[PDB]
Amino acid sequence: SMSVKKPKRDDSKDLALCSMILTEMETHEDAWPFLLPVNLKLVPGYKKVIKKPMDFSTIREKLSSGQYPNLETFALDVRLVFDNCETFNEDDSDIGRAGHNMRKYFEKKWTDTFK
C-alpha cells in the first residue's frame, strides 16, 4: 500500500530473456503455422471467429518497439497464439498438433527461465 512495498524483483533482464525465448520459438520446426499473421482474405471464417489474431512476427515487432509493459503481457500474447490455434484447428491435424507441441515447448522455457 502507500509507502509499503514488497522487495524489488530484478526485471532488468526480462526483455533480453523474452527475446531469447521468442527466438527459440521462431526456430522450432513446428513454428511454421505461427510465423506470420493468418491471411484474413484467404482463410474463410478466421476474421469472424478469431477476435484477437496473434502470431510470432507480431509479437516480435511489439517486443522490439516497447509495446510490452511487462513479461506477463508478453506471455499473454504467446498463449493467445496457441489458444487461437486450438479454437480454429482440430487436435488431430498437423496445425492442431503443432500448436500443442509449441505451447508445451513455451511453457517449459517460461518456467525454467522465470519460476
Resolution (angstroms) equals: 1.7
Residue 18 belongs to domain spanning: 1-115
Domain count, the chain: 1
Q: What is the DSSP string of 62-114?
A: HHHTT--SSHHHHHHHHHHHHHHHHHHS-TTSHHHHHHHHHHHHHHHHHHHHH
Structure-block grid coordinates of residue 105: 515447448
Q: Are 99 and 86 in contact (CB under 8 A)?
A: yes
Report the structure determination method. X-ray
CATH number of the domain where residue 101 is located: 1.20.920.10
In whole angstroms, how far apart are CA 45 and each of 38, 42, 48, 71? 11, 9, 6, 31
Give the C-alpha separation, 72 to 18, whole Å: 10
Q: Are 43 and 80 in contact (CB under 8 A)?
A: no
Give the C-alpha separation, 81 to 84, whole Å: 5
